[PDB]
Structures are given as structure tokens and as C-alpha cells.
Amino acid sequence: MYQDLIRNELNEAAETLANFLKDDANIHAIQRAAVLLADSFKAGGKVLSCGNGGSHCDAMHFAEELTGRYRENRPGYPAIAISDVSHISCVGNDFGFNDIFSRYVEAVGREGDVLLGISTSGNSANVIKAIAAAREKGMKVITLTGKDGGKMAGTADIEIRVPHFGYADRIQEIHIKVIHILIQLIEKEMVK
Amino acid sequence: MYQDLIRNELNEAAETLANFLKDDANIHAIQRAAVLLADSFKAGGKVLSCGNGGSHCDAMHFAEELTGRYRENRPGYPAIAISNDIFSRYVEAVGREGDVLLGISTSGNSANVIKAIAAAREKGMKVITLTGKDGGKMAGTADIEIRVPHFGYADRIQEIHIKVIHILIQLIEKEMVK
């Protein structure tokens, strides 16, 4: 019988969400993010999303939702989720410590574009390398993070940080809620 | 400007989690789902997961986490995520009696999930579904259905589905080391 266990997990997610919505700064960070993204599309830029693990799915839903919405009457792609095009992670043992995300920024980023880097610990080495490639490319940087923000703390133009300090599950669950919301706020921006 | 919209959507997530967690049937369905999954794995079976749009991702994380944890020293793949016959044709090509289909559909009306369910029954497989609203056309056709009582837009349902997936993975781990 694991009913206690189930309810504890769900309750912990409810405290996470509560803790998250209570801080104004988080709410303001999400609005700023959405404005940046939409300003950037409007200027003809695109966003590259990336994340490891479960966060790679968040990076994917965010790019494919924005692309599916804004591809009509626009060149290119408004958003792309960076993927392992050259199969560099096919040696297995993937800790994130690789140049899959920064390679991709180097090959396709342009000045004006946006990097959305997702990292539930703020320590993902591939995401830190993409932020540096982004800076070299002249792209603005949005991060969705957790805990104390890890080593990426301070390196993003806009950081949306989830105040949870244990395992990644609780933090990923708030990130996909943030992404659902970014996408609706951007739709309000994109008619204006 | 949007501050209120942001908080509103967060609060609606908080309302959805509270109404999901408050109904014992949803808690019991999660425990039974994990027990059937674990028991399948113990008997040498696999689980095929599928879903559309954002749900596809959830089906992907479910399958990859599970295969990552149990592949070593066990033949085959513990879980495979698939990708209107795109899911049924795969079930038809690889399902075996004793496997399990996990079909994810926030409205319960995904035609491609529905067809995968019917292929599953033809191969003698069990059926777990992650749903929303009233369970839609899928209601009744799963052996175990975890249904999110939210009757609005899909986003809020998906966000509970991923919490369910994270907990299944936990509970299956306790079952497997038993």
C-alpha cells in the first residue's frame, strides 16, 4: 500500500506551486520572459530551446507550440528545440557535460535570437556552454531553473527560478506550467 | 500587465491538483497502475506508451526512465514510447500477450489512442490510461484509468499527468526491488 507515498508526493508538488506563486519576482520574471520572446520574434528572431532529461521534453513542447502557431507568413522557424544532431550522446553516460547545445548555437544562432536554457539544478554543463555561445552570438538568454540557481545564477538576462531544493521532479513540474503560461502570454503579445 | 493572468493560471493548476488529490479513487488508480506495470516487468513483459502533442513527451519520459533503470541484465526493452493508425500499427507489429499499453489523452477522445487500445486487446495486452474530463470516448475501455477531474483546457490535465508519471516511476522502483 503506497497511498501515503502518493499523497505525499502530490502534497509536496502543491507546496512547491504555492511557494512559487507567492513570490512576486517569479511572476514578474515570467512576464518579462514572454515579452522578450515576443519582441524578439517581432524583430524576426528565433528562440533555441534546450534541456536535459525530462527538461528536454519541456524544451520540445515550447518550440513546437511556438512554431506551430507562428510559422504562417513568416520565414524559417520561430523556435527550435536543440537536439543531438551529430549523435554525440550515443556513447551513453550522458551527464550533460557536452557541446550539443553550444554547437548548435554556434551553427545556427544570430544576433537577436533567444536562448531558453532549462536546468532544474542550474548546473548543467551543456546549458552553461550554450549560454556562453549565445553571448558570443549576441543573443539574449532566458533560463528556467531550480534550487539556488547553481552555477548559471546571474548569467541569464531573465531567470525563472523554482524554489525547491530536493529532486528534479518537483522543479520540472513547475517548468512545464511556466511554459504553458509563457506560450499564452506570448500569444497576447503576438496580436499586438 | 499579465500579472493577474499568470497568477490565475497558477491558481487554476493548484485547484486542479487539489481536486485530483482529494478523490481516493485517483490515488488508488495510481497504486494499481504501478503494481500492474511492475508485475508485467517481473513476468518479462514490456510497456508501450503513446500520447499526442504534449502528452507525447510524457509517454517519452515514462518509457526512457523505465528502460534506463531496468534494461541492464534483462532481455529486450522494459518500455518503448511509440513515435490514425500510427500507434495501432506499432502495437500490431510488436505487442505480445502480457505487455501493457499506456495511452495518454487529456480529453479521452484521441482517435489514434483509441485505435491503439483496440490493437492492444487483440494481442491480449492490459491497458492503463492517463485521461481528463469525463474520460471521453476512451472511458471504460482501460483496465485502469487515472482520470484528472478537470473539464477546461488540456494544459492543466497534462501538468497533473506528468506528476502521475513521476510517481509511477517511484512506485514501480519499490515494486521492483521487492
Swiss-Prot record, chain B:
It is found in: Cytoplasm. Pathway: Carbohydrate biosynthesis; D-glycero-D-manno-heptose 7-phosphate biosynthesis; D-glycero-alpha-D-manno-heptose 7-phosphate and D-glycero-beta-D-manno-heptose 7-phosphate from sedoheptulose 7-phosphate: step 1/1; Bacterial outer membrane biogenesis; LPS core biosynthesis. The keyword Cytoplasm applies. It catalyses: 2 D-sedoheptulose 7-phosphate = D-glycero-alpha-D-manno-heptose 7-phosphate + D-glycero-beta-D-manno-heptose 7-phosphate. Its cofactor is Zn(2+). Belongs to the SIS family. GmhA subfamily. This is Phosphoheptose isomerase. It comes from Escherichia coli (strain K12). The gene is gmhA.
